[PDB]
Amino acid sequence: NDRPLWFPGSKAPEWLDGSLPGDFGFDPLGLGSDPELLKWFVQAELVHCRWAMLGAAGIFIPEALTKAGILNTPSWNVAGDQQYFADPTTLFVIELILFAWAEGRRWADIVNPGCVNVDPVFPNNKLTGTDVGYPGGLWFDPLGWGQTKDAKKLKELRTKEIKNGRLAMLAVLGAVVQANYTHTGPIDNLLAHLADPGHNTIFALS
Amino acid sequence: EVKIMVEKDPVKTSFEKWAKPGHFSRTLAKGPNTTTWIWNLHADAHDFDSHTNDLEEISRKVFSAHFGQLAVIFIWLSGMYFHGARFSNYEAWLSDPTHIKPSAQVVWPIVGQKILNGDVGGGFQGIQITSGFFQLWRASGITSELQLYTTAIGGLIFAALMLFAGWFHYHKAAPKLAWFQNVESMLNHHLAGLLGLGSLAWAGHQVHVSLPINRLLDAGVDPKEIPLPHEFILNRDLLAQLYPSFSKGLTPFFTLNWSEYSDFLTFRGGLNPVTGGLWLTDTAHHHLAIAVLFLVAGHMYRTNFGIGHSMKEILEAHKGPFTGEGHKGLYEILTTSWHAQLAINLAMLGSLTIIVAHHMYAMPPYPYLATDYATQLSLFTHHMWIGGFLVVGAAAHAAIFMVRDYDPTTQYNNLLDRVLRHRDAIISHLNWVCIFLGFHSFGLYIHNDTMSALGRPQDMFSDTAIQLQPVFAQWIQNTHALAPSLTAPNATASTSLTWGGGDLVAVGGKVALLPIPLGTADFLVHHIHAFTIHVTVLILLKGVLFARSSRLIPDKANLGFRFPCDGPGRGGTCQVSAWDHVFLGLFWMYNAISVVIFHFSWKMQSDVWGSISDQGVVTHITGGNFAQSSITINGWLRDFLWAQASQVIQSYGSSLSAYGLLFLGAHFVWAFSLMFLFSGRGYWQELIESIVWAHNKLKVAPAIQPRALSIVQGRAVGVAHYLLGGIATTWAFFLARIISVG
Amino acid sequence: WVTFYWHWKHITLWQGNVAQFNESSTYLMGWLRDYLWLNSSQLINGYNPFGMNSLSVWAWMFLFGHLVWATGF
Amino acid sequence: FASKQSLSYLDGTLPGDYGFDPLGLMDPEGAGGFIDPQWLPYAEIINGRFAMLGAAGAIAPEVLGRIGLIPQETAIPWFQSGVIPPVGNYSYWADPYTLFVLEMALMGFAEHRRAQDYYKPGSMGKQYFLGLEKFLGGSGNPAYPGGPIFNFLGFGKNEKELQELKVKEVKNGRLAMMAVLGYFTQAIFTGVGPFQNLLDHLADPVHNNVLTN
Amino acid sequence: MQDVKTYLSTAPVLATLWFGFLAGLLIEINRFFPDALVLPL
Ligand code: CLA
Ligand code: CLA
Ligand SMILES: CC(/C=C/C=C(C)/C=C/[C@@]12O[C@]1(C)C[C@@H](O)CC2(C)C)=C\C=C\C=C(C)\C=C\C=C(C)\C=C\[C@@]12O[C@]1(C)C[C@@H](O)CC2(C)C
Ligand code: SF4
């Protein structure tokens, strides 16, 4: 019953209880009132923070390696206007074709839990996940981590994950906004800031 | 006695009452059996005094609705300012206000409508606006799009603020009935605080920023080189370069030696000779005087500080021989009934709108306003229509009060009772005078038409034949023409140029104003105006007085304010309620205001406007054909409708095409109104059965049974479509004419 | 409607330019401008502040009609 | 004890209960919103605290620079230093706007905790505050938090001297409020700091009082 | 949240959402396929 909140002194809403990881009682608008929508929004936020982790790692690290005089990949903004073996429309069509399968199987898992776990070609592989959102299995969990004591090693790991994912979402949104406010790379913003944190900030333009 | 009264959190904010569509009234909260539920839901959606019965909840709802309305108005204003900032040729207009047509709206190119973005000038392409916002911003001192952007944001903030208040004072801290009833303090604060301090603040803004900027704009300097409005606040020397009186500091005001402020606090009639508008040095003085007037007038009524009047001892003290027990029992009427207040407020606000529309055209208060004819015509017509609607609303709400708030057990106070007790005389005499006016106004036109048709013009009522010169208006004109010499020694010139005195003023070609003549053609139309106004008063007053009972139906107050008819008996009793009298008076208000705006349009294009050339020769638009051709209905048919309607009809393929389209659209809507105005519910209800049969035959019968519109909703729809069609037709015609030829 | 159609068709046939009806009737402002507004120039001018002519009676009757029509409302 | 009658709420309890309320803004009949008798004393208390903290800093640079102690960076007027750009501003180690957002970020923490202690008295002692979780519980009235930190010396032991200190504080706060209002006003009709105004009044009051402009 | 969905399930709100989506669709089609008088199929 004892747990810290996003706003000390407040009272956690009734639909939030800290059972699910990353819970801090933050839901002012009541967007997660009924459980029918909560069980959907948790998967939404999970897929979101994972995609944001991937995107932030893809944006910030190559930028640093380019500025570190190591790599030479272009800026993250204009990675579309490059030279690949096929048009962006063809790559997008191939992406959608490949993603329809995966996202449909995930959708079927969300709607009817467990209805889709066996390899439809070699019907013996039998993904080992038990909770929707954490599919487990050798493919999505090779190193065995994830099947531990009921709490304090699983719930702890999941909340330590969502905590990183929310930060990643904020970071990538910030990079997106900065790449339009200051027409430089995301690491150039940090460099110019640390060069003069007094006068170099968002207020240094208008 | 007078104190703050609030009930903490009287209504929990939630979405429960939001999911149940009908919730305010229990009669229709159950659900839509038939399809006459969707209609009366929206009908009595705002009937606050009908849902409940206690004045407290009604007052709270009224307060919060006022706050919501204010929020919507703030959103509207912020939108207008943002459009003037982002999609307007304002900065280009400022450099040449006499060759650049205002425009603050652009259209996306999608389906060929791109041609609505006409060539207005300055490198811009957009619809030419007529709101007069450019002149208002030029008079305010606004000289850059930036200064618009900010204020737009400002408006938005207030909007949110208003909304917040609207929620707060209904859900967190709502007052109780005893608080709203303090009318003495309410009037004290609206006189001293809202009007007085508001006028004082605007006079301050004028005298500090609007005077120097506009003076430098009149001296012919670039609107970009003019210092910013704060360089005259933190530099009294930079401001004293124009009005050196500022060099004397704030000392003249405090030593009562303020007759040295004659530089920026002037008293001069006429218009500025270069902008065709009033002197801002005069409007600053006007606002400074109005502010102190309202301030010292805001100390009249008694609060908990011992002194002041009480608006009950004032009323009872007026009780004469002829009028029974005087104004007794009226303070109890205007503090326990929201309708008896809405009636007076609507009547006064409508009359005030008419006064404003009459004053602004005759004394143009904004620079380059009298020059732009389109703006000066739209600002007249719009305000006239608004006032005409508000007065009819006042009549309707007085009728509502009389129907369901009046009671005699306390109204033995023989002022309202006495006027209720000779209605059969009031209405009889009003009917007789209406008949007399109608004859002696329209029969003269019919006489002139028959004579000019019988080849005998010498028997007409023209200005050459038998004359009807209005002598009283001419005497008033001659009296006001000589006022600055005998009856106003300090005013340098007459208040307006419309008086016979004075001369002409030019704004670079087109004329602004000149002395207006008055002949027989004006006598006739003024009597027609009087006649139509009298008929409207007849209808509305008859409804208001007979709202309770009559010889036909002695128990009409039991039936209610809004009901179709009491059977086909007594010969017939259709359209017998007060709502039906308002329905009938809307058409006569429309007639009256249409005649007024036609009068103004033709008279201005004929005897006022034009374009003067060198050596003084001035040729009006139509050519002064109003004094001779406006005495016969045929003249109004060809010389006004047929002639001036020749711009809108052939506007296809031009930037004025939308007016040509809306001409026919409004014609269609007007003619569509007749289907509802002429028919009746029974035929349509019967016809609907033969369609429900075809639906049942294919198993597509809806569960909400399709009943036809009620007998009152048919009338409402008919009058709404009629008014929309008529006003939109006149709108399109007026704009398509004046934009091209003005 | 029928009489409007017939009268405009035959007016344009008798004048000599059938290609005015044949081209200005496919829309609705054409009926209001090329038939009603255009062919009313000698009607309303049946009498004026400059005199009167043979059409004056019609210029009366025309207006007369309107009055009666409006009174029906 | 005069200038109004102690109607039903200014009996004499609160520190500074001079029975002055000619309008009735503490009247408990209509009290909802922000003018309940529990928010007005608190608002007066901390407005007086901030006025006491500001009416000293408004003069401190101007009066210190006359002693020649501070270098000639002390703006003789209290307003030519950043707070109002168009009439003069001093250049610090950062933009006034980033200084403003840093001030707002540092003050949000300082003020939300106090707000939560007002609305929820016992709170702000339960949630683990980062670093050293300090004992900042709501020890009594939300205007007198007590505590071993907000009372370094424990000045005021029992009711008598504590009430005397409280009434002294509220009176000094009212005086400082009037002082900062005077600062604001007479910074407009003169155009110079308040200490210079006092000096020029000491020069000769016959030709240098308010009735000279 | 359930009552919010119920309110969004009302007739005027669904009507305006549907008609706005349809207006957007038709407007985009006409901005990309303008002046269509004869079906080229
Ligand atoms: C200060 C202004 C004001 C206020 C506060 C009220 C307030 C009220 N009036 Mg009222 N009224 C006013 C002005 C005002 N009126 C004016 C100026 C008139 C004269 C026309 C009337 C005539 C009038 C009548 C005849 C009646 C009321 C009634 C009412 C009550 C219920 C109103 C309701 O539910 O409507 C709900 C609102 C609607 C159903 C909206 C209808 C849509 C309108 C008619 C069309 C708007 C056209 C628009 C401008 C453009 C059209 C094109 C676009 C839609 C595409 C309410 C107390 C009724 C009552 O019983 O009172 C107790 C009643 O029967 N009023
Ligand atoms: C053009 C159509 C028209 C006309 C002429 C009238 C005429 C009249 N309406 Mg009216 N009305 C109309 C449309 C019309 N209405 C419509 C559409 C509505 C629906 C909203 C109403 C709603 C309405 C109401 C609600 C009221 C009127 C009233 C009146 C009368 C006002 C009194 C007056 O001025 O007498 C003057 C009359 C005329 C100018 C008519 C022409 C007379 C000519 C010039 C004289 C002819 C000479 C000689 C007699 C001819 C002899 C012929 C013989 C030899 C064969 C008047 C009879 C009011 C009323 O009853 O007041 C008394 C009233 O309360 N009407
Ligand atoms: C998924 C995501 C980022 C994904 C990044 C990707 C795919 C990377 C893409 C790229 O690598 C490619 C493709 C190509 C590279 O060359 C360039 C880029 C383009 C960079 C961000 C989510 C970003 C999502 C963010 C930041 C969301 C923030 C939401 C908040 C704070 C909401 C709060 C509330 O909803 C609650 C919590 C409760 C309510 O009651 C109250 C409110 C307030 C409504
Ligand atoms: S309206 Fe209804 S009630 Fe009045 S007559 Fe016609 S039918 Fe009978």
Side-chain angles (χ1 to χ4, degrees):
Chain A
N1 76 113
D2 190 23
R3 92 178 196 276
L5 315 179
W6 75 283
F7 186 61
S10 191
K11 44 197 178 314
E14 69 155 10
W15 53 88
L16 291 180
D17 218 321
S19 42
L20 72 184
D23 180 287
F24 291 79
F26 174 83
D27 181 20
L29 262 41
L31 250 62
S33 279
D34 51 348
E36 179 85 352
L37 268 89
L38 210 53
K39 304 184 175 301
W40 180 263
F41 283 146
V42 297
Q43 314 274 0
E45 172 201 52
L46 206 57
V47 180
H48 255 266
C49 52
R50 291 174 174 154
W51 276 111
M53 286 166 169
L54 279 177
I59 292 176
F60 287 113
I61 311 179
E63 278 318 307
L65 278 173
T66 302
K67 186 58 59 103
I70 293 294
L71 284 190
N72 232 6
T73 165
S75 48
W76 84 262
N77 320 350
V78 304
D81 296 296
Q82 291 306 312
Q83 272 302 142
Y84 315 93
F85 46 76
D87 257 310
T89 305
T90 295
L91 311 179
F92 181 50
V93 152
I94 299 177
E95 186 160 62
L96 284 191
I97 290 276
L98 281 200
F99 253 72
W101 184 266
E103 289 295 86
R105 293 194 84 111
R106 173 165 80 79
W107 206 347
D109 184 21
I110 291 176
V111 173
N112 183 6
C115 65
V116 53
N117 258 272
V118 197
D119 185 355
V121 185
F122 310 86
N124 48 97
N125 297 335
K126 193 155 292 179
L127 279 199
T128 90
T130 69
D131 345 331
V132 276
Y134 310 116
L138 163 150
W139 259 4
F140 304 142
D141 186 24
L143 271 304
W145 274 300
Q147 309 284 23
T148 54
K149 48 168 170 300
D150 195 284
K152 314 189 303 304
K153 188 45 185 297
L154 247 168
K155 192 177 169 187
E156 196 269 358
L157 211 164
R158 301 175 173 174
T159 179
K160 109 202 307 182
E161 178 140 287
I162 308 203
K163 254 188 163 171
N164 249 309
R166 300 170 180 173
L167 186 50
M169 294 193 275
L170 295 197
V172 53
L173 173 61
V176 166
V177 165
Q178 290 150 235
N180 182 230
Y181 206 62
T182 84
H183 313 270
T184 78
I187 189 51
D188 278 0
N189 295 342
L190 179 75
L191 290 194
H193 183 80
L194 297 194
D196 196 339
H199 292 218
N200 275 334
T201 166
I202 180 177
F203 297 127
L205 274 98
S206 203
Chain B
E1 271 270 20
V2 167
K3 68 177 71 77
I4 307 268
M5 299 270 253
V6 169
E7 176 181 355
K8 311 168 47 61
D9 201 330
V11 160
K12 162 192 171 60
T13 164
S14 73
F15 277 76
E16 319 308 321
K17 254 63 62 189
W18 208 315
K20 294 100 195 170
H23 74 265
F24 36 85
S25 95
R26 89 287 182 177
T27 129
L28 69 104
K30 313 167 173 183
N33 286 111
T34 78
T35 182
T36 64
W37 181 91
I38 295 97
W39 294 127
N40 39 41
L41 158 65
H42 308 80
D44 47 53
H46 283 142
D47 223 304
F48 290 160
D49 54 13
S50 153
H51 315 324
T52 166
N53 314 77
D54 40 10
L55 221 61
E56 181 149 322
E57 277 72 359
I58 303 171
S59 314
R60 295 163 174 183
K61 295 179 173 200
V62 164
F63 207 24
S64 316
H66 292 184
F67 270 116
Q69 163 69 90
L70 276 188
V72 178
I73 282 190
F74 266 114
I75 296 170
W76 177 71
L77 260 195
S78 101
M80 301 300 101
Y81 274 103
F82 184 86
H83 267 94
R86 181 58 173 86
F87 318 96
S88 144
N89 64 346
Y90 185 53
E91 297 193 357
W93 183 80
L94 272 191
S95 315
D96 204 12
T98 48
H99 304 270
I100 305 272
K101 263 83 192 155
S103 149
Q105 166 182 7
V106 301
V107 174
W108 285 325
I110 175 192
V111 285
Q113 72 191 11
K114 36 193 77 69
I115 75 160
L116 299 183
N117 300 336
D119 320 306
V120 287
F124 202 81
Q125 280 191 333
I127 303 161
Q128 168 184 346
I129 69 145
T130 169
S131 323
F133 258 127
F134 284 16
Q135 283 87 322
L136 167 63
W137 299 339
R138 160 85 160 240
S140 313
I142 281 190
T143 190
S144 87
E145 298 192 338
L146 172 59
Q147 286 167 335
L148 300 171
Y149 270 127
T150 56
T151 208
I153 314 302
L156 273 199
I157 281 171
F158 280 89
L161 285 198
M162 294 285 124
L163 271 194
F164 169 79
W167 169 79
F168 181 66
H169 280 304
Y170 194 44
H171 283 90
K172 193 64 64 180
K176 28 191 50 178
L177 172 57
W179 184 77
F180 296 106
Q181 297 205 125
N182 311 285
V183 295
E184 263 82 5
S185 179
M186 191 159 171
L187 257 162
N188 266 126
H189 283 286
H190 289 159
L191 285 200
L194 175 76
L195 294 186
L197 294 185
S199 198
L200 180 53
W202 177 251
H205 163 89
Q206 284 233 296
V207 86
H208 258 289
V209 358
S210 202
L211 256 52
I213 288 196
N214 258 295
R215 169 158 182 163
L216 278 173
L217 278 162
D218 302 320
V221 317
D222 190 309
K224 287 272 153 53
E225 278 86 308
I226 302 197
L228 284 181
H230 52 279
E231 328 283 352
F232 301 114
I233 280 190
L234 60 106
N235 269 102
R236 206 181 31 197
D237 192 340
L238 188 56
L239 173 49
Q241 292 185 329
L242 316 107
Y243 308 110
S245 173
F246 270 68
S247 299
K248 286 135 198 168
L250 210 58
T251 295
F253 173 83
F254 278 98
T255 76
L256 309 185
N257 255 319
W258 60 40
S259 63
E260 321 176 15
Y261 285 161
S262 300
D263 286 10
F264 50 99
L265 296 190
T266 50
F267 209 139
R268 30 171 34 192
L271 320 163
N272 187 307
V274 315
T275 57
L278 299 171
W279 294 99
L280 309 186
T281 88
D282 214 8
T283 75
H285 192 188
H286 157 247
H287 289 125
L288 178 55
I290 274 289
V292 42
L293 199 69
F294 280 107
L295 272 170
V296 315
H299 307 66
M300 183 174 185
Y301 307 114
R302 183 180 314 149
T303 50
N304 34 24
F305 309 115
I307 75 180
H309 267 117
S310 93
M311 306 190 278
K312 166 173 288 179
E313 311 190 341
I314 296 191
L315 289 179
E316 266 80 325
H318 299 67
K319 165 202 166 186
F322 299 78
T323 47
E325 285 182 25
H327 310 75
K328 197 163 212 314
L330 294 167
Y331 184 79
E332 288 79 358
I333 292 265
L334 296 144
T335 75
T336 84
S337 86
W338 283 90
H339 287 285
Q341 274 284 4
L342 188 45
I344 310 186
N345 294 17
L346 263 203
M348 298 324 289
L349 193 63
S351 290
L352 181 56
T353 316
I354 312 289
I355 311 280
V356 163
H358 261 272
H359 287 181
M360 275 181 60
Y361 87 81
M363 300 170 283
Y366 303 111
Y368 306 109
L369 178 72
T371 313
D372 204 357
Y373 300 146
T375 296
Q376 191 83 314
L377 176 53
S378 321
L379 290 180
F380 189 88
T381 308
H382 156 277
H383 286 139
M384 287 295 303
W385 282 118
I386 300 297
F389 267 95
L390 295 189
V391 296
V392 176
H397 286 297
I400 278 159
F401 156 79
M402 195 69 43
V403 153
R404 63 204 209 192
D405 268 307
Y406 163 96
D407 82 312
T409 89
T410 84
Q411 216 50 231
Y412 203 78
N413 272 333
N414 295 348
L415 230 300
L416 174 62
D417 202 60
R418 293 204 132 192
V419 53
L420 277 206
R421 269 160 42 184
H422 60 285
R423 48 194 199 193
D424 323 72
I426 302 197
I427 311 296
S428 288
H429 296 261
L430 188 38
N431 171 276
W432 167 79
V433 60
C434 278
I435 286 193
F436 161 67
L437 275 164
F439 270 123
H440 293 58
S441 41
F442 191 67
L444 299 189
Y445 273 91
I446 303 304
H447 178 133
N448 281 336
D449 214 6
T450 36
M451 286 337 175
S452 162
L454 282 168
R456 25 192 291 211
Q458 64 273 359
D459 296 325
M460 292 210 303
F461 276 97
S462 99
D463 271 329
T464 89
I466 323 168
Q467 299 203 342
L468 293 175
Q469 306 275 90
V471 278
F472 307 137
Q474 283 157 343
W475 191 76
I476 297 300
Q477 285 207 336
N478 206 39
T479 284
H480 303 181
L482 303 151
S485 316
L486 191 46
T487 53
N490 286 82
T492 66
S494 40
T495 140
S496 158
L497 273 35
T498 35
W499 312 129
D503 47 320
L504 180 50
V505 303
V507 192
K510 341 209 283 179
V511 1
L513 264 196
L514 36 66
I516 286 184
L518 287 157
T520 291
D522 304 46
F523 180 91
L524 307 176
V525 60
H526 279 75
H527 280 51
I528 277 190
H529 292 343
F531 151 64
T532 70
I533 291 161
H534 276 54
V535 174
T536 320
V537 186
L538 169 57
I539 304 149
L540 298 179
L541 190 69
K542 164 168 189 324
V544 163
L545 293 192
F546 291 87
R548 288 212 71 77
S549 72
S550 62
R551 292 203 216 281
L552 208 54
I553 304 170
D555 47 11
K556 195 154 43 153
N558 266 335
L559 284 162
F561 160 78
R562 184 166 58 189
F563 67 95
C565 73
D566 201 45
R570 313 185 188 86
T573 38
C574 293
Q575 286 195 41
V576 83
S577 40
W579 191 97
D580 319 322
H581 290 76
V582 180
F583 168 68
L584 285 181
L586 272 163
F587 294 94
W588 265 100
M589 179 270 295
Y590 167 81
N591 211 33
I593 303 296
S594 198
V595 176
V596 185
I597 65 185
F598 280 3
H599 178 188
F600 172 85
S601 182
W602 199 4
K603 171 63 148 179
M604 279 275 158
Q605 301 178 37
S606 195
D607 289 358
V608 169
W609 300 329
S611 90
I612 89 163
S613 161
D614 277 293
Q615 296 60 62
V617 45
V618 45
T619 88
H620 301 291
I621 298 190
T622 79
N625 65 342
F626 174 78
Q628 198 52 229
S629 156
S630 101
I631 51 164
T632 59
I633 316 295
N634 208 32
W636 288 90
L637 201 62
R638 49 144 198 282
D639 285 311
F640 189 69
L641 286 212
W642 183 88
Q644 311 212 24
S646 82
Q647 331 284 155
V648 47
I649 52 167
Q650 64 201 35
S651 45
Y652 275 8
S654 75
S655 33
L656 291 200
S657 203
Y659 302 117
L661 285 153
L662 291 180
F663 201 56
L664 296 144
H667 277 203
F668 179 92
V669 178
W670 181 86
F672 190 74
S673 93
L674 307 175
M675 168 169 66
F676 300 88
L677 278 190
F678 290 176
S679 161
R681 187 188 181 281
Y683 168 85
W684 304 100
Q685 181 53 257
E686 272 181 339
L687 161 74
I688 282 179
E689 299 174 358
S690 282
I691 311 175
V692 178
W693 177 91
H695 281 46
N696 300 7
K697 190 72 183 181
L698 285 187
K699 296 183 181 178
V700 278
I704 304 186
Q705 320 190 55
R707 312 261 174 272
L709 321 179
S710 75
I711 329 180
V712 165
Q713 196 189 346
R715 306 173 180 162
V717 171
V719 73
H721 291 44
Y722 196 111
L723 293 197
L724 211 186
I727 304 172
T729 302
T730 302
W731 175 91
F733 162 59
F734 272 179
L735 269 153
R737 163 68 166 190
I738 197 74
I739 289 273
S740 61
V741 207
Chain C
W1 284 339
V2 176
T3 51
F4 281 17
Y5 177 28
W6 192 96
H7 182 215
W8 197 15
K9 189 103 153 170
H10 276 86
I11 274 275
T12 47
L13 179 75
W14 295 325
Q15 285 185 336
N17 56 337
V18 59
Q20 185 188 41
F21 173 87
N22 219 275
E23 211 180 323
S24 315
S25 45
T26 48
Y27 55 109
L28 222 36
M29 172 71 84
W31 285 82
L32 194 57
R33 168 195 60 211
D34 295 6
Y35 179 48
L36 292 194
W37 177 91
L38 166 62
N39 292 117
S40 309
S41 285
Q42 290 167 348
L43 215 174
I44 61 200
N45 271 277
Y47 57 91
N48 47 41
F50 318 113
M52 55 92 67
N53 65 336
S54 167
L55 311 195
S56 156
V57 47
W58 311 108
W60 207 78
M61 167 176 304
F62 191 75
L63 278 180
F64 175 79
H66 290 228
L67 190 53
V68 181
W69 191 79
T71 326
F73 284 32
Chain D
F1 268 33
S3 58
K4 192 241 177 208
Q5 75 287 14
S6 306
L7 269 183
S8 40
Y9 40 103
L10 303 196
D11 55 79
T13 302
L14 302 123
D17 201 313
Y18 282 17
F20 172 74
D21 208 31
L23 303 202
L25 303 189
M26 218 177 163
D27 183 19
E29 199 173 323
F34 264 148
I35 67 164
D36 33 10
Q38 288 75 5
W39 179 270
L40 283 201
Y42 193 25
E44 170 173 32
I45 281 295
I46 93 173
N47 264 234
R49 297 212 226 254
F50 274 107
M52 268 188 292
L53 203 33
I59 54 177
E62 175 183 359
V63 60
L64 279 183
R66 266 282 147 71
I67 328 289
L69 172 54
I70 331 294
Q72 278 303 300
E73 56 81 23
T74 137
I76 319 174
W78 61 265
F79 46 74
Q80 268 192 17
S81 79
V83 61
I84 307 178
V87 290
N89 64 333
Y90 191 97
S91 200
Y92 304 101
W93 60 271
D95 210 24
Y97 288 97
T98 179
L99 247 50
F100 182 46
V101 60
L102 165 58
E103 147 195 14
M104 299 310 282
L106 285 192
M107 201 61 65
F109 284 107
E111 295 285 315
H112 287 150
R113 306 263 301 173
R114 188 170 59 76
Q116 287 302 123
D117 197 334
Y118 174 83
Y119 290 118
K120 294 289 175 63
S123 313
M124 282 324 166
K126 304 165 167 174
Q127 178 99 341
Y128 163 85
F129 200 95
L130 302 322
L132 276 193
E133 157 61 43
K134 192 54 203 64
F135 309 149
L136 319 103
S139 286
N141 185 294
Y144 308 95
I149 177 188
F150 289 113
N151 217 159
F152 262 146
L153 318 180
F155 227 129
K157 294 299 174 68
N158 43 93
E159 279 52 32
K160 178 68 219 62
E161 73 281 33
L162 201 52
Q163 213 67 19
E164 183 57 3
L165 281 171
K166 288 172 174 191
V167 60
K168 289 174 169 179
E169 175 181 327
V170 314
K171 291 196 80 184
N172 289 260
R174 298 174 193 175
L175 173 58
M177 273 180 270
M178 300 309 303
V180 59
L181 179 62
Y183 292 167
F184 282 164
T185 291
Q186 81 198 44
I188 296 183
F189 296 165
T190 76
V192 61
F195 184 74
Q196 201 64 218
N197 281 138
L198 185 75
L199 284 180
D200 299 7
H201 190 44
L202 287 186
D204 61 319
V206 46
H207 310 289
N208 268 109
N209 77 76
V210 69
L211 305 180
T212 50
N213 38 31
Chain E
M1 193 59 208
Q2 167 183 143
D3 301 69
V4 179
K5 285 140 61 197
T6 297
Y7 168 60
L8 290 190
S9 273
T10 326
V13 202
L14 287 198
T16 178
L17 285 159
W18 194 243
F19 287 142
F21 165 75
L22 190 73
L25 176 71
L26 267 310
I27 282 159
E28 291 326 271
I29 293 186
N30 287 110
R31 193 199 53 185
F32 279 132
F33 296 81
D35 314 357
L37 196 47
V38 43
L39 185 42
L41 184 94

